[PDB]
Design a protein around this ligand. Structure first.
Ligand SMILES: [Cl-]
Ligand SMILES: [Cl-]
Length: 162
């Protein structure tokens, strides 16, 4: 297992514009297009993302291209962030994937708000971080996915994904 296979399980793949769990226009493997309620705004963000006139539909290759860019961008957002970077550097390879998963889902500013959890993760107090991570809107809105990510931070194994 790796970050790509993990996110593909958590996000799914849809080739036509859809609404994510928050009601936002999204496509592909969790690629958010726009928070605006306008499907025409989404279609235009989508054409710009893909570089052609899509009419709300993309191919699987195109979905995987956006996915690669979004994973790369998430990693780069962690390393550029003064609060996320030292935590990520301290973590083993499996838990690093859990951090990327969170940034991918909620953005670098969202994750950097988990100040107490990040501190416990840095200190390798795994059971305590897992408890604190769950006291969150994140966990209450998407409990099954959040549980899988929290288990990954708690154990340092891919067990929740197999
Ligand atoms: Cl893009
Ligand atoms: Cl979920």
């Amino acid at each position: 297992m790796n970050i790509f296979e993990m996110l593909r399980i958590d996000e799914g793949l849809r080739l036509k514009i859809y609404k994510d769990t928050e009601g936002y226009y999204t496509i592909g493997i969790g690629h958010l297009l726009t928070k605006s309620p306008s499907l025409n705004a989404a279609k235009s963000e989508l054409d710009k993302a893909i570089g052609r006139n899509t009419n709300g539909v993309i191919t699987k290759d195109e979905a995987e291209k956006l996915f690669n860019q979004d994973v790369d961008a998430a990693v780069r957002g962690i390393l550029r962030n003064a609060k996320l970077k030292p935590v990520y550097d301290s973590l083993d390879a499996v838990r690093r994937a859990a951090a990327i998963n969170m940034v991918f889902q909620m953005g670098e500013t969202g994750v950097a708000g988990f100040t107490n959890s990040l501190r416990m993760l840095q200190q390798k107090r795994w059971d305590e971080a897992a408890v604190n991570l769950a006291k969150s809107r994140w966990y209450n809105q998407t409990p099954n996915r959040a549980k899988r990510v929290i288990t990954t931070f708690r154990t340092g194994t891919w067990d929740a994904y197999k």
